[PDB]
């Protein structure tokens, strides 16, 4: 049951956390210090619950947010697999399925090395179940999808795989025995005992990626770092719509008509046999691997699509419905570009004036979009991809709009002119994204190492039996140095009151507080800016005015790019440029997606400097409806979460460098807003012993010697740090 050595008295602090949340079917919220193996804590009891079957049943789904750390989950549990294996004697059967679908896909050297995921998987599925489903037999057009054919033969066969694999395993096994990740995974979902994949993949309302069978008997799912659920769920149902998309769609309108015109009865009587079968008994014909290729369920919590074949009986008639839609939709676009308008169910009502038959052909469209292409089975998917966007949209507008939100954003965001207007359909109820989750599941446990206010689980608007505060001791001398700055000499203004471009007199001493941090602190630092143009504003005075003149002389600097390609470059450098004779401080952005998937080690990356209040500051009026609805839920929330949204991202970013429990961390706080907000947002285990013991308005020049005093002592021989042997009560 892997105590395996001194475990820094925590597994016992989490032992009863399982036994309360699982034996009593507790939903459950865990605080966890960033300095704790996210699974060595959790899975060691979870895999212990896998062996300890209660009445009978113990499922496992797990998810996280980044596919390298997904494999890092897998990585040491293989020894945990091996650990008790020798100890309990023999070895029982196991499976953990890393199912990163859209990522690793085809071994074939022609399909494979085209860069993006979705379009190339469209080439794959167009080849498999659109070319070799339409043109079944053949020699050259059939090509060579041997791995899918191997799966079809293996469907009759019953193998038994080994343990949990990776995305590089099925790749090398593609030339050996594996029949490719997509289907070997379908056969392994049949008897899966543990699934790990992305937090995103489950939470796709666009294509409803139903992972298991809907079996809520004991559906046992585990959650780590589940911080920005809104930024998942609302963005999971967020619908962007380009004018350039529509005109391309306008161009393949009559393009598809030419396919209709050239086909007289060949694909048309193919429809006629089965469109009659659509009327007689309803059954999907694209339910092979095309169910996950097409919009599985845009609006999942519905009863059924009972009266399919909506007010539309023919195909060009159905095509005219989109002519009735799109051409009206640009009429619902182009005039509307003068005023931002937030009217979600009023739009569909005014649409009902314009659309002749509504609310059934709005909801029964995206399949009849697809199915009238399914009798074709011709059009390449990336060509058809901006169209599937559209029949997704009014389908979403058809069903869930009165609780949800329509926003129209034509004006200046990377367009200085009006050259690309856009609108968006957001949802608002991440609850209603996670209510079907909860109804499909048993009672499933969030763990977030950043979540200090427990009051934000009712921002998820849900119920909780178990929600406490995890308190761990530190006989490791001192876990960390949290250091709120508040300079008095250079007069702290670190919140953007006079904003990131309103004055540079604020900015005259962020270099000073950094270079001295650079001068003292060795061994690589990853700091967090607010945004890319903020970052662009950050270094804007830094070149022309004299700033780097000692900064490059002390360590070096790793610019992270708006483009993720060049952003991954310095990364290749930073893991190297620290581990050689160079400190090489990396420079980065909190809210940007450079802040996940890393888990910095004492090897490289052991200090973080705050820069400003880490709040949104960018997207207009996505607030107000989201604001007023929680004001329709709890009514004093303007002040409230608009603190915590910064805070939930802060230690999400900031509290990352410390792992194990001796790994160090210098998480200083250059901030103007600290009085309650930083204190509310910091962990109750972390405000208590460490944050502002007697160090609040710590001018950097004074705070210089703090880290000096910190490290020099803390780099002395560590004879023993909270050594546990046998069980001696202690009772916390």
């Amino acid at each position: 049951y892997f105590p395996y050595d001194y475990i820094y008295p925590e597994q016992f602090s989490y032992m009863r956390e399982l036994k309360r949340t699982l034996d009593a079917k507790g939903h459950g919220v865990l605080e966890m210090p960033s300095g704790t193996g996210k699974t060595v804590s959790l899975l060691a009891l979870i895999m212990a619950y896998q062996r300890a079957y209660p009445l009978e049943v113990t499922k496992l789904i797990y998810c996280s947010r980044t596919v390298p750390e997904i494999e890092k989950v897998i990585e040491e549990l293989r020894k945990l697999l091996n650990f008790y294996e020798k100890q309990e004697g023999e070895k029982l059967p196991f499976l953990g399925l890393a199912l990163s679908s859209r990522k690793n896909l085809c071994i074939h050297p022609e399909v494979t090395p085209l860069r993006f995921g979705k379009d190339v998987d469209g080439k794959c599925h167009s080849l498999t179940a659109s070319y070799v489903r339409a043109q079944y037999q053949h020699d050259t057009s059939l090509p060579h999808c041997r791995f899918y054919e191997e799966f079809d033969a293996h469907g009759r066969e019953v193998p038994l795989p080994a343990g949990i694999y990776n995305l590089d395993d099925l790749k090398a096994l593609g030339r050996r025995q594996g029949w490719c990740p997509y289907f070997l995974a379908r056969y392994s979902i049949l008897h899966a005992n543990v699934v790990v994949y992305s937090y995103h993949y489950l939470l796709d309302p666009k294509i409803a990626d139903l992972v298991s069978k809907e079996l809520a008997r004991k559906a046992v799912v585990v959650f780590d770092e589940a911080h920005n659920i809104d930024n998942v769920c609302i963005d999971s149902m967020s619908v962007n719509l380009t004018r350039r998309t529509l005109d391309r769609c306008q161009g393949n309108l009559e393009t598809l008509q030419k396919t209709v015109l050239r086909i007289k009865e060949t694909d048309e009587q193919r429809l006629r046999d089965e469109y009659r079968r659509l009327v007689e008994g309803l059954r999907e014909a694209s339910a092979a691997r095309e169910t996950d290729a097409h919009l599985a369920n845009p609006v999942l919590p519905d009863e059924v699509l009972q009266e399919a074949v909506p007010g539309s009986i023919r195909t060009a008639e159905h095509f005219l419905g989109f002519l009735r839609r799109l051409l009206e939709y640009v009429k619902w676009r182009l005039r509307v570009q003068h005023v931002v308008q937030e009217s979600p169910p009023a739009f569909l009502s005014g649409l009902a004036q314009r659309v002749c038959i509504q609310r059934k052909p709005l909801r029964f469209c995206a399949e009849r979009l697809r199915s009238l292409l399914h009798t074709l089975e011709i059009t390449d998917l990336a060509d058809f991809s901006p169209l599937t966007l559209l029949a997704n949209f009014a389908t979403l507008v058809s069903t869930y709009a009165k609780g949800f939100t329509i926003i129209i954003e034509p004006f200046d965001d990377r367009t200085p002119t009006i050259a690309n207007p856009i609108l968006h359909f957001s949802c608002m109820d991440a609850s209603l994204a996670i209510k079907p989750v909860f109804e499909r599941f048993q009672s499933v446990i969030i763990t977030s190492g950043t979540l200090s206010p427990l009051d934000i689980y009712p921002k998820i608007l849900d119920f909780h039996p178990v929600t406490m505060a995890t308190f761990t001791m530190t006989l490791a001398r001192v876990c960390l140095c949290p250091m709120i700055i508040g300079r008095g000499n250079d007069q702290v203004a670190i919140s953007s009151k006079f904003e990131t471009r309103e004055d540079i007199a604020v900015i005259r001493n962020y270099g000073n507080l950094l270079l001295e941090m650079s001068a003292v602190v060795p061994d690589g630092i990853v700091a967090f800016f607010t945004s890319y143009q903020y970052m662009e504003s950050t270094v804007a005075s830094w070149y022309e005015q004299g700033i780097l003149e000692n900064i490059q002389r002390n360590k070096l600097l790793f610019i992270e790019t708006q483009d993720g390609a060049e952003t991954s470059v310095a990364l290749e450098k930073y893991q190297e440029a620290c581990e050689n004779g160079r400190g090489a401080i990396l420079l980065s952005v909190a809210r940007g997606k450079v802040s996940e998937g890393i888990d910095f080690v004492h090897h490289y990356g052991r200090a973080v400097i705050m820069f400003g209040v880490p709040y949104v500051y960018t997207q207009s009026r996505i607030l107000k409806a989201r604001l007023e609805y929680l004001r329709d839920q709890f009514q004093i929330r303007e002040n409230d979460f608009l603190t915590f949204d910064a805070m939930r991202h802060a230690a999400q970013c900031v509290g990352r460098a410390i792992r194990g429990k001796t790994d160090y961390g210098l998480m200083v706080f250059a901030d103007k807003r600290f009085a309650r907000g930083d204190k509310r947002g910091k962990l109750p285990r972390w405000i208590q012993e460490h944050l502002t013991d007697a160090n609040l308005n710590l001018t950097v020049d004074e705070g210089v010697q703090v880290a000096k005093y910190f490290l020099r002592q803390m780099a002395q021989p560590f004879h023993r740090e909270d050594q546990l042997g046998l069980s001696l009560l202690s009772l916390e």
């Binding site: 859209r102 002389r553 470059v569 450098k573 160079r582 997606k593």
Partner: protein
């Protein structure tokens, strides 16, 4: 080899008399003198501000790139050279525009005046380096693809083609993105300029020793803060075992040295009937006898008045108070007998000891018949005549007088002998053909 013998006049003064007194050749001079300092003494001109410069100067290349309109050309590296010592294809580009800017001094300003500020599009040569660095980053792009682990460019891409989104997350900039078009253009180039300066490590990391493993992710990464690996393991009884046997040998042979043994047991044998204890009986009797004799101190009142034993005690005092007849003035020809041998023969003799130590060295292994090289077995023969002849006229120059000569030649014949010892001992191990 010749700049070595000219910049150093002391070693040249050593190198003179092998040509002046014709001791050895230059071929023999660089055959057995240097041989080690070819790595040690030549370790100055090669390093020179750490060559294979990757992460030493690169910290200071940007702050020390400009003092003034002509603040350049310090020494060798001064402030321009290691800039050239990193860029290679860009060094070919420098060579391309030196005639474009005519004067090299003009090039030093022009080629670096506009590239320093924002952007350099005035000359083909400046544009050559400018366009190349975009290709360099394009070239640097391909190398980062080959590593491809712990790189969330992979991990980010899986979440954006899937809904066809995160193009709005790019296109969502606040704060007046309408009418400037200045620093938007500028800063990304400075972003690009310092990423060049960042990849200038990468542009010089290949210079190190080509530095390649490119990271196939090594899928273990076992978080080992625990475990107690405890890297060093001494104390498996190594000097415990020495102490058990050497003090045992210091027990059974306690100081078998010069006076340390031979006087020791000889007087222990003189103790004689000590196991018989008849001497020890009389001892313990004499322990009991003068037991009382000390404490009374009437016998030890007058254990002083023997002026009979003062005169002799005064005598060897006075005898050692005046030693006489031992050449009080022992020097006073030594100044002449210093400056004449310490003009050449201090260095001349040193010509031998740079060689004769190696002459001891090849014979220090020769009967094993391993270090038996033709380079060495005739180097036995080579300097043998090259030294023992060239001393004979320095020997014969000082036998101008007789007792002025015969004192110092008692001490020089070791040089003749340690030569002939080696030669004499050479055939004690008779070498075959």
């Amino acid at each position: 080899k010749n700049r070595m013998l000219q910049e150093d006049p002391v070693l040249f003064q050593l190198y003179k008399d092998l040509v002046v007194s014709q001791v050895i050749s230059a071929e023999e001079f660089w055959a057995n003198r240097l041989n080690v300092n070819a790595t040690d003494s030549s370790s100055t001109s090669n390093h020179k501000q750490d060559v294979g410069i990757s992460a030493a100067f690169l910290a200071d290349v940007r702050p020390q790139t400009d003092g003034c309109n002509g603040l350049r050309y310090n020494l060798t590296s001064d402030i321009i050279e290691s800039i050239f010592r990193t860029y290679p294809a860009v060094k070919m580009k420098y060579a391309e525009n030196v005639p474009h800017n005519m004067t090299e001094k003009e090039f030093w300003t022009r080629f670096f005046q506009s590239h320093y500020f924002h952007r350099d599009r005035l000359n083909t040569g400046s544009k050559d380096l400018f366009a190349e660095c975009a290709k360099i980053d394009e070239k640097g792009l391909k190398t980062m693809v080959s590593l491809g682990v712990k790189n969330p460019l992979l991990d980010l891409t899986a979440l954006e083609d899937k809904p066809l989104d995160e193009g709005y997350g790019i296109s969502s900039v606040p704060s007046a993105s309408n009418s400037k078009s200045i620093k938007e253009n500028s800063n990304a180039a400075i972003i690009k300029r310092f990423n060049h300066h960042s990849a200038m490590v990468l542009a010089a990391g290949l210079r190190k020793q080509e530095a390649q493993n490119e990271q196939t992710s090594e899928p273990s990464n076992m978080d080992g803060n625990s475990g107690d690996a405890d890297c060093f393991q001494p104390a498996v009884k190594r000097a415990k075992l020495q102490e058990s046997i050497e003090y045992e040998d210091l027990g059974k042979n306690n100081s078998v040295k010069t006076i340390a043994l031979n006087l020791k047991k000889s007087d222990r044998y003189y103790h004689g009937p000590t196991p018989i204890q008849s001497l020890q009986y009389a001892t313990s009797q004499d322990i009991i006898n003068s037991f009382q004799s000390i404490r009374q101190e009437m016998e030890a009142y007058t254990p002083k008045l023997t002026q009979v034993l003062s005169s002799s005690a005064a005598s060897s005092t006075i005898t050692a108070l005046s030693p006489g007849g031992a050449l009080m003035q022992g020097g006073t020809q030594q100044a002449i007998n210093q400056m004449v041998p310490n003009d050449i023969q201090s260095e001349l003799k040193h010509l031998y000891v740079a060689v004769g130590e190696l002459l001891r060295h090849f014979w220090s292994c020769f009967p094993v018949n391993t270090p038996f090289l033709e380079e060495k077995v005739v180097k036995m023969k080579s300097n043998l005549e090259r030294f023992q002849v060239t001393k004979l006229c320095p020997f014969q120059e000082k036998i101008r007088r007789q007792y002025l000569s015969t004192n110092l030649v008692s001490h020089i014949e070791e040089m003749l002998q340690t030569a002939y010892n080696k030669l004499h001992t050479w055939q004690s191990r008779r070498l075959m053909k």
